[PDB]
Symmetry: D2
Amino acid sequence: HPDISVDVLVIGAGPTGLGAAKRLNQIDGPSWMIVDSNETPGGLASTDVTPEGFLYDVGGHVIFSHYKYFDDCLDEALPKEDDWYTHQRISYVRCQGQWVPYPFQNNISMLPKEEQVKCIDGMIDAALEARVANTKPKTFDEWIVRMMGTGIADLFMRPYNFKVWAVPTTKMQCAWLGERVAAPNLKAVTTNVILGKTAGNWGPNATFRFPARGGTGGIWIAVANTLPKEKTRFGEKGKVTKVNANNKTVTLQDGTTIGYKKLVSTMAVDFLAEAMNDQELVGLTKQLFYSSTHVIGVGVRGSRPERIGDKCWLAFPEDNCPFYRATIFSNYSPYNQPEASAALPTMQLADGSRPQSTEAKEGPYWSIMLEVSESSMKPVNQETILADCIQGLVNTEMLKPTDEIVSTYHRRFDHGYPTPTLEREGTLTQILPKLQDKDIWSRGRFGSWRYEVGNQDHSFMLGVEAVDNIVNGAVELTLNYPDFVNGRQNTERRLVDGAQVFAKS
Amino acid sequence: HPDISVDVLVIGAGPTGLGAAKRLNQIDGPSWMIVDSNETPGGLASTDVTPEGFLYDVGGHVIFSHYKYFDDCLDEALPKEDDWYTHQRISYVRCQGQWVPYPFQNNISMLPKEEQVKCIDGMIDAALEARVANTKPKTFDEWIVRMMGTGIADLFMRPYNFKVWAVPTTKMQCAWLGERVAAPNLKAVTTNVILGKTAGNWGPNATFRFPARGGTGGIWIAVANTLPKEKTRFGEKGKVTKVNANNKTVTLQDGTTIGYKKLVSTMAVDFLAEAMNDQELVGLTKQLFYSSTHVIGVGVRGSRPERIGDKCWLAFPEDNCPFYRATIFSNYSPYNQPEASAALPTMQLADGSRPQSTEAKEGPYWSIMLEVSESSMKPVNQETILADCIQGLVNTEMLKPTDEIVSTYHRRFDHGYPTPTLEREGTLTQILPKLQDKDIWSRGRFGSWRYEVGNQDHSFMLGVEAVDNIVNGAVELTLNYPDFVNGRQNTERRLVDGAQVFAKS
Amino acid sequence: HPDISVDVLVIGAGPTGLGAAKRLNQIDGPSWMIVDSNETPGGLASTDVTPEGFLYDVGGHVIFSHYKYFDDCLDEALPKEDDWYTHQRISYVRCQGQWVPYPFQNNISMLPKEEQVKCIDGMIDAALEARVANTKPKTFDEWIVRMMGTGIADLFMRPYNFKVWAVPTTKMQCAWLGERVAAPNLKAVTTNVILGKTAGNWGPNATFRFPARGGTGGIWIAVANTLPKEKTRFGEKGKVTKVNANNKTVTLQDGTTIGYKKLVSTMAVDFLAEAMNDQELVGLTKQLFYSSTHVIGVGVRGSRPERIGDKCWLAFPEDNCPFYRATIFSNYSPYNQPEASAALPTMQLADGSRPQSTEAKEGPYWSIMLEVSESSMKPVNQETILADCIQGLVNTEMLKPTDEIVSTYHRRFDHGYPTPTLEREGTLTQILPKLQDKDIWSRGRFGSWRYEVGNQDHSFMLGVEAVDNIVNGAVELTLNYPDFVNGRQNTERRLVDGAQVFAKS
Amino acid sequence: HPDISVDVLVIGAGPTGLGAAKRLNQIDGPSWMIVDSNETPGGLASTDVTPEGFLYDVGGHVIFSHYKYFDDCLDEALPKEDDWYTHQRISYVRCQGQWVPYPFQNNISMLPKEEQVKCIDGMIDAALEARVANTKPKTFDEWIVRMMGTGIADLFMRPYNFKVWAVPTTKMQCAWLGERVAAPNLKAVTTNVILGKTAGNWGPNATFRFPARGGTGGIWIAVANTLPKEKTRFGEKGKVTKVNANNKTVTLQDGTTIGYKKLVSTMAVDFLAEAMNDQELVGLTKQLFYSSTHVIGVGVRGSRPERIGDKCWLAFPEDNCPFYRATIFSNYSPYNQPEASAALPTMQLADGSRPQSTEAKEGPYWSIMLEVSESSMKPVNQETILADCIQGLVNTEMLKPTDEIVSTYHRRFDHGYPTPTLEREGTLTQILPKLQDKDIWSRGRFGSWRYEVGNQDHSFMLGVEAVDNIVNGAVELTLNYPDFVNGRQNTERRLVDGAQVFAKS
């Protein structure tokens, strides 16, 4: 007999695992426990801090919630108004010396007129083709060209998405983008070109909220803190090293054994196959594809430059920089970096020069967070990527050569993005049912490998819905029907359901 | 203080109400109670019997289940293999002196060649138009013509559906038919014409099961028998006369008062509004439309004629009979009519004349069940409808003039079909949320008025999912997303979920 | 026996009649003669002069020749380089305070940005419709909208063409515009809008030549002068009053009778029917439709204004003036108006006021020629049309209020344009072959009533080809195939053919 | 100084040259003469006879006249009713053991049903493609598939046209086929399939007339006999060996020189280029492509077999015979073969057997004329082609193994068909203008190399129109606008025009 026995065991305390725990804790029926190899919950939604006091998320993390249940739990975890800062969803694309408002195609009036003509001509071709289209696009690349036409595709979405996914657009499926017809809004595009107009897809009602303190990781620490501590096991003491699917037993690194009736696993499914010593599953999961993520952080001395302003995140299709995305992380919360009175020495100038003085000087400070993707199709030199990012900051005119860098950060995350390859579904529909047959719910960004339901709210809810399926026979909608859950506000499931109301009576 | 207080009150013990009761009974959390004005549960899924021993459902009732939960409850209710008879889904269209296998358009090779030419010419027009179509059809009629072309539309779906819905096809929406593109399968249709081929949409894997005894009503009696009797109130004692939504109180005909926290109402929503004495709701529910259904039963002396054979149900576009559908109800179970040894006198010949003998004679017997629709747009002479139906049987060569009729049945059901009018949804999105705000879940064939989720299984699950929404915060998928539930095997929810398993341990 | 007998009699000595005469003279086989009621040949291609010395054509006459034969005869008639002035085909559309280069749609960058948006949106609609179009347009209006889209149609071609044709665009056929598919060049139109480009359809290789002296009428006087005088009868002595088609006899006003073997009639075909005393034909010709042309001429003191410049003709869609076309006739030849030293008193100012003195002042002078259409669908108040035109010149900023008018001209031409109505071809097929069967070739702008072959070169060649059909069995290509002759350089037929080269040898 | 001088020299007395001569003779203006290397006029429209008395044209020659002038000359040449036999245009396609009436696609009901399905499915694809097509086909093959769809294309037009043209369909242009849109008449094809109908494109309307005596060649002998003998030079006496274009001199084989002002050359333009000793023209003409024609004639003993009946000509797509076309030449005139009382020995049976008796026996006789094409892409073994043709007659069930052959004929015509290659126009538009600049009108089947105007009437009229261009400045419509002349009734030009009527006065 095992050291511990529970009805439902949850492996991992990122958002998905925490969702499973929150729903299990609410239901308060079957016995359960959650484990994690990290002492701090949060997974890829955690936050680091440099010795100089600059916080960095695991790349740009902006919350858009499709679910009231998610909202309930974040509200519970961080209930005060000053626990959060609200911002508009302000983003741009760097192109040919310009900050072009997203969406790119509605703002090409900023480009040279000859380029506008080529763009519009290509979109006219796409519009005429779409009028007689009777097939769906099969690849991400086809989807892009049918939507934008060749000229606009070539300027932004084609080169940008290679930099993001670290695979060519021709090697990815497009079903993950949803049911919308791949067709241009030619009138919208020509109208803004004709009016010489720019317009971003943000405004007073297109906002996100960010935690005042501790970065995105602050949320998940706070959510985890609402759980009964004795049902959690976080740290080296919580590291899973072996899963015996046949005996429904998990072994931890310290030798502790846990018996389960149902297993919710949120570790990367390729790690799970290895932990299970299941050769067939190892083979299948190796057919999946993922990219790694390099997160680079740069802390800069000075008040926020006017050229930066209220920018939140920034997309980079061009090859004068290695990152695909920059986030003005200092814009998300004043507590993502030190206060202005904090004294820090200049480490280097943005052009690589040594500072004139080694003396600690005061702020204020601002902060840029960068992401560079890596895969077998897109190698990254770990030894030079930081310097290359900083040079890229000068090339893109985010930093002047003279700007004073007072903190740097670089961390590589092996499993960064689960890639929507052409082969993904053919592989997943072999893996997930085999795991299911063994009473294993493998769920999450790399637990079930579907990027289109791979944000914090989707992950949280994948855990919630897995538990609801286990206990109440609910449909796992987020898992199997991304278009469904993303196309509605999911309002029915709440942190207090009828069940708990009636029980308290 | 009311006489009785429960957390959830269920009004009606047709399939919807019994669904709610079954789920409540399973969850075994909130207190509940179910009432019906009829001593016998089943509603429109009940069965009558004539004094001569011939059973009749409320028109043709053939089960196709989209849900494992529904299967579980029928299996529990009637667990023995001999509780059921299995049949292939054999149906035909009566057209120009012939029985044309369904689907009609795949079988027009049976028609005169000149008529085939007109049919194919019409479908070629429809295919060519479909090739450049960039709008969705807005009416049932438009949908029909885009699918079939004019010729085929005029032969079957146009005149048949007026006979069915008692409103013209131009006055109905078409969303209720699903998301499939309205376009002809020209190749399939021309291929069968070229090959001189007929092919029905049935076979060994296209079957239905029917209760051995008591007709369809036998199911719902048996399902209801699994509920705790003290939580049921069926008959005059269970007739709801008044609903006070603000007090959350229901008053029964015998004066009994019931307080509720949540109400699941499965009576027709126009009747609920009246019982609520809510004039705004009364006004809104009067914007809905329904047809009445006349059910006519004819019991016939003789072994089953070869011309009838294994036919199950039959559709009648033509004017030579008033019914839209006939069911060979004696093919569904041998216990739907008397045994051969039963002595019964002939009441009349099918040609309407008196029998030569008044003497009771033996069987065997077979049985025809007919449906005639009625609305304000399609009046029916009730005084002559039995005789008209019987002459219709002679006109369509179902009965010979000399066939001996030993039993007749006629009953009018006021609320027969909830009509998918163009106006339906605009009206329902005013009614259903207004009731919802008052903690009233109005659900079912006329509880929520959506035909596309209006069969026995849909109805049962509307009740189940309403309770699940009330208690566990489930999405009411059947109610709000008919295409979703009808397009998949719904397997997740079971009569025994993890909750019951874990609690029993 | 008649007073005169010829093989071929030509009625009318406008361009069509003169063409027949020239070919007859060249062939020099069958006997012939030509008559006209006017002492001066030229018909609608004649020129008037005011008592103050200002010439006016019958509205704007610009020669574009599709035929070498026509060139040969014009070269023969006016062989000197200084007999002609060459100009580029410079024309504009007046729209919203702007002179917009023709073609209008390539030049809408001159309009406000909001007008550009409306124009391009409309043309986008037309492009998408054209992509799936499988029918030809049936009316001029349909043709226009398919070519231009609604916004551009509404700004120019729709209102302009009513002002031109004196019938709505919806009442005219569109085959006369040729076989080019009615579809927009969206790329060309958007490209010029994006680039902020204008471009007229003229240049060094898009020119016309205009007679140095005597206006357009000088040409036909000179052409007629090359004919043997004794084969002409021009003036009251040449006025046809009766045509007896059965006797093949023509009676002139002075009583002279002419017997013919073949008749080439170039008078308006409705006049011919009357002269034939043929009630059936009269009835048919009354089914045809034509507009009348008011020609207004305005002579102005001053050197040519900068705002006018090298403009040749101008189109006016807007309702701030009654004319559809203005011609800067003083730009066509310096001899279309008096020399600068000629003394003329001011008749009125452009604002309508009287001048101070009767003092004759010198020039220089320039000259505007206007056209206003009239029909039963579009009446013209003859008493005020001169004053209305002059106010139109002020409204359109062609004349300043203070500009000094030194000469005015107004003349109404009853048969101005033969209208391409929907009914035209159906009526002509009943008329022209009936005349043909009587050895009457009715040809010309109103002889055969086809505007698309109704210019001077077309008309001349209708006369030439009729004779060629009569004598040499040639196809009448201009008459029956406008698209054919207008889409090629017709080079084969010359004023000296092999026949004459060989004969002289 | 040349031996003879004429205004117009005509080389060749096939139909083109005779057209030129007839029009020259009619005009009776410029002096002229016509020469041919053959003592008998007719060119490829001539007729041979075997020593046994069987006539053979140069393959199937069926007249369809597009011109009144052509009709006039044939009527003049052979004015008696009994100079001609009239027949309906009866033709079939040999396919899979069946004689399928032309047009093939309207008669595929004769094929197996499974094959009808494949044909109709292919034509449905083509119909749906044609609905959204926005480009013209560029090759004969693309045109075929767009008209017929793949299945029908593969059965007849694709293999047949290779056997006809001796080049693949992918190597030919399709403009020569005319302006009709390449698109299926799907309804016509499905209608006949559904009705089980066969229908040929012939009837009392669709007829041809064939000369009573001398074959097609009798026409051209008779036409030539209307020319003044002294202006003709036929035989070795008239063989052109050299054309000196710069001196406008022709040299004949006997040394006679002829000076001309204008040359109408109807010899093959590649021979002309050689005769001109013009290396540039030789190079260009070698870029043209042509196929050779083998004509095989078989005289058969017996009354006309029932299986043959009234068939006129027959097309052979399949590879069980080398010929592409068979003509029942004995159906064209009773005088194409000996009378029944003429005695002839059997040469062989159709299966190659020796006859039982060597004795002369009587008829009646019938007669088959066959065509086999040859090119560098499709060699023909001249030593075996007769035997292979005869075996082909057995294979196609035209002859029984027992049928008695009493006469055979084989002749190879080097220039048979001018090929409408993709390259043809690019080459001709270089050749013909250069010849034109030297006053050489090269015209005819190989004079101007355009098959679509390469029949007897087209050829005749090319000659007529060249003369008309030389003398009267006529447009050469047949040469430059095949679509124009083939799409109309050309009635204007007559053998007696006004010019001759007036002159006789």
